[PDB]
Design a protein around this ligand. Structure first.
Ligand code: NA
Ligand code: NA
Lengths: 508, 508
């Protein structure tokens, strides 16, 4: 019975073994260079294998590092709060209000019904709705909400046969990929973008070119091209791309339209909470764009001479906190009080208060690798290197990030490589964004295994996909994504970000 | 129908009215001194009236202040993390593990059964158990858990008659008061202590005399004396204090002992999770005390020459994160995996992630009142004053804090007065602790109205108390608490804190 017991408690045994087996490195060295490497290896292993929760692992460098004589040092000019925390709080308020009233279901069903009834057009509508929802909501929640609806749609469309199996695989894969693809577009879409934004804001406080509007402007074309190419590739791989059929309704089309319509009525008539949430969401969609657009000069906002009147944090929370006071539900007296349309206990959830601890642990580990001699021990390997051109370094960095994120969680991968890429970016005397942006975009490209990211695991949990097919589709999707990211870096990101010219905010 | 509509939506109307009616102060002045006072008044009104959640109000100074031209300034030497955040995380892990397995119920029932069956001794046992539980758990949760048990106990003891009504009032009041009284003993007992600890750590980073062991050592005698005197006073007010009966069992005693025992079996036999949680809790009880005790020299811990080997944060989390990996519950396969005895989604709740935003808003408001001229406009009133002796300033400060906390939430009161008391403490050239400690202790003394603090509201929610009786008991309890706090400040806190001598960490 030992075999079953070992196979059950793999997590505890692996944690204990990983902790214990690296003790030779400190004990037979008694050197700070080895003692910091011990902590780095343990934390990296726990992050990549997911033995403990990511925040739990990130808390480790604050505890085991001081035991070795290495303690947090240096200082900061953080003052308090940030321009990013406020924007994040506002976006989370918006997402909570959208989710708790099931407005996202109405939006998704409306788009699916409106796009059309052609199966290729139906998959395109599913992908577009999922990406649009994942722009604001989280990838995990968006996928877990959209998947049941699509499963019902395919079950009732096929109820009117390997074709159904193939179509269901196609729609599962397209939803899984579109969640992440739409995550790239906005800063709040994915926790990886949150980690990159926080790290860049802390490490380069002078740099302020990174914000919601600029991020959307430089990420939207890449996401759109990737979405279209991925839809085409998925359609071609499973079904056949009938160009003539793309270009009088059959019985099947009428039946599927009826099914979609009756699901839409099953959602129910619109309510006051849904309409007020939609109005506030539309108001938030504006005043974020048209403030400082990259291409079109926007003078409607930020035309005031007063400083700080128009900024992302202000326009975010000044509207978001309205979700905490607008009367939604009243109430045999029932205390005769209304409902705030959002309760603070609901905002306590749905909020990235674990990415904060994660990036804090990343900072602690990076600062630990700034004293002693581990940093120099790693950097002396750069002496034989460094003759490689910048584009080549970009190529290896992007390929390594994409390869690692296939078998590791995206936040762990980004927090593991970003504090390594940044010093390398500053060493070669190149714009740090030139290195970080392709790597940050490619981190989310984890399109191969259910273990890669939660959306893929949720999609595979329905047990209607095979690993071989998922890998076959994801190889093409990842190749297309990497190609489009490289094309964007070479073509249009540089003029709007000045990637070729070294910046003033970067250190000498 | 206008009257009912107004009486229902008082919160929204009051928020709008408070925001709008103070616009004369900025508009007809156009002065930064008035524009900062406008924000201060609005935030203070929202904090004291609880129109919006406290964190929502604390977010306001980050939004409306920059609109007036006043922006966050200065810098900090925070580095990252703290010695307090790690300890708080460890204590919250311990509390979550205790609560989710219903160990606190077993502890409370065991103490109640063990203390005795005499009604005075029964109330003393209830008070002692509630205080001991509230030392680690939160006051709100401790009261909300203990109250049903005591209600059942009194209902079945009286089932074997105004005496039952009087005894039930007595036990309700004693639980309500003991929750807060036990909250004072430890730093993590009450959110007010968290706010004071965070503010003191940020404003005086050099000062390190404030930690778990020192806080317990200087707060335990005061809490114990207050508890004993409050028990005596509550017993005398409602029942009669029969000294002869204090000093052969009657039928009523046998019946109540049987009722307590059968409730104890109703709790159920002990489990593995409960025993492992108790073992880890006992281990955490040690190694916090006996590390650096105030009176008895403790050399069992902190005897290592290695720096940072023995500290509160390390001994807290090195044991707390064990709650995240110890196998509690296994699992027709059910994936054959164990349960970590704590899930990160459970630690996301039960955690003071709103006090962080609250103290951040307090810092933002205080820093706003450091530039322009509002600080000088308030401080020029100190020129006629300042001849008052230090003890007199203590007296007015403590009375004002106690009076305000009767009708306001304790965290709001402490975050409103602490950034005002600290500059006053530094101005008179006196130890800041001498001012802050009596005020911080007296802040929790809110023993009069259900609106004062959540434990009183929960106790009154059962509807077996009257406001007149609650006020009558709370006046005596508050007088006793204030007297004991003053006696402690005069007698034994000074030798262990050096309150009479100005400290080096305080600014010149
Ligand atoms: Na998302
Ligand atoms: Na408590």
């Amino acid at each position: 019975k030992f075999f079953s017991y070992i196979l059950v408690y793999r997590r505890f045994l692996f944690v204990v073994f990983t902790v214990l087996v690296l003790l030779p490195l400190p004990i037979v060295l008694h050197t700070k260079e080895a003692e910091c490497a011990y902590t780095l290896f343990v934390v990296a292993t726990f992050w990549l294998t997911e033995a403990l929760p990511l925040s739990v692992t990130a808390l480790l460098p604050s505890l085991m590092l001081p035991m070795f004589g290495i303690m947090p040092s240096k200082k900061v000019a953080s003052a308090y709060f940030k321009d990013f925390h406020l924007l994040l709080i506002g976006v989370i308020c918006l997402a909570t209000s959208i989710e708790k009233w099931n407005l996202h279901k109405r939006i998704a069903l409306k788009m699916v019904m409106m796009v059309g009834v052609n199966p290729a057009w139906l998959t395109l509508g599913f992908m577009s709705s999922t990406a649009f929802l994942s722009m604001w909501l989280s990838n995990t929640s968006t996928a877990a909400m959209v998947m049941p609806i699509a499963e019902a749609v395919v079950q009732q469309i096929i109820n009117a046969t390997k074709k159904g199996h193939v179509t269901r695989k196609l729609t599962c894969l397209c939803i899984a990929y579109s969640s992440t693809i739409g995550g790239l577009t906005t800063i709040t879409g994915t926790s990886t973008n949150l980690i990159f934004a926080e790290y860049f804001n802390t490490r380069y406080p002078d740099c302020r070119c990174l914000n919601f509007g600029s991020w959307f402007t430089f990420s939207f074309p890449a996401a759109l091209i990737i979405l279209l190419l991925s839809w085409i590739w998925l359609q071609w791989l499973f079904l056949g791309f009938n160009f003539k059929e793309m270009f009088t309704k059959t019985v099947q089309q009428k039946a599927c339209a009826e099914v979609i319509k009756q699901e839409y009525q099953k959602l129910g008539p619109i309510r006051y909470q849904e309409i007020v949430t939609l109005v506030l969401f539309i108001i938030m969609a504006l005043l974020w764009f048209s403030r400082d657009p990259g291409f079109v000069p926007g003078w409607s906002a930020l035309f005031s001479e007063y400083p700080g009147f128009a900024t992302d944090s202000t326009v975010a929370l000044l509207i978001g906190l309205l979700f905490f006071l607008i009367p939604a539900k009243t109430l045999e007296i029932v205390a005769f009080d209304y409902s705030p349309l959002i309760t603070w206990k609901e905002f306590q959830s749905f909020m990235p208060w674990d990415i904060a601890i994660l990036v804090g642990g990343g900072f602690a580990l990076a600062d630990g690798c700034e004293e002693s001699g581990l940093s120099k021990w790693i950097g002396n390997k750069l002496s034989p290197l460094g003759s490689l051109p910048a584009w080549l370094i970009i190529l290896i960095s992007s390929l390594m990030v994409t390869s690692l994120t296939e078998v590791a969680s995206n936040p762990a991968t980004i927090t593991l490589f970003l504090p390594i890429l940044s010093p390398l970016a500053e060493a070669i005397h190149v714009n740090p964004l030139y290195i970080l942006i392709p790597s940050t975009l490619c981190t989310s490209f984890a399109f191969l295994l259910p273990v890669a990211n939660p959306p893929n695991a949720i999609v595979f949990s329905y047990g209607h996909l095979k690993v071989i097919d998922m890998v076959k589709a994801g190889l093409g999707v990842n190749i297309v994504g990497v190609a489009v990211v490289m094309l964007g870096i070479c073509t249009w990101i540089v003029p709007m970000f000045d990637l070729y010219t070294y910046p003033s905010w970067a250190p000498a």
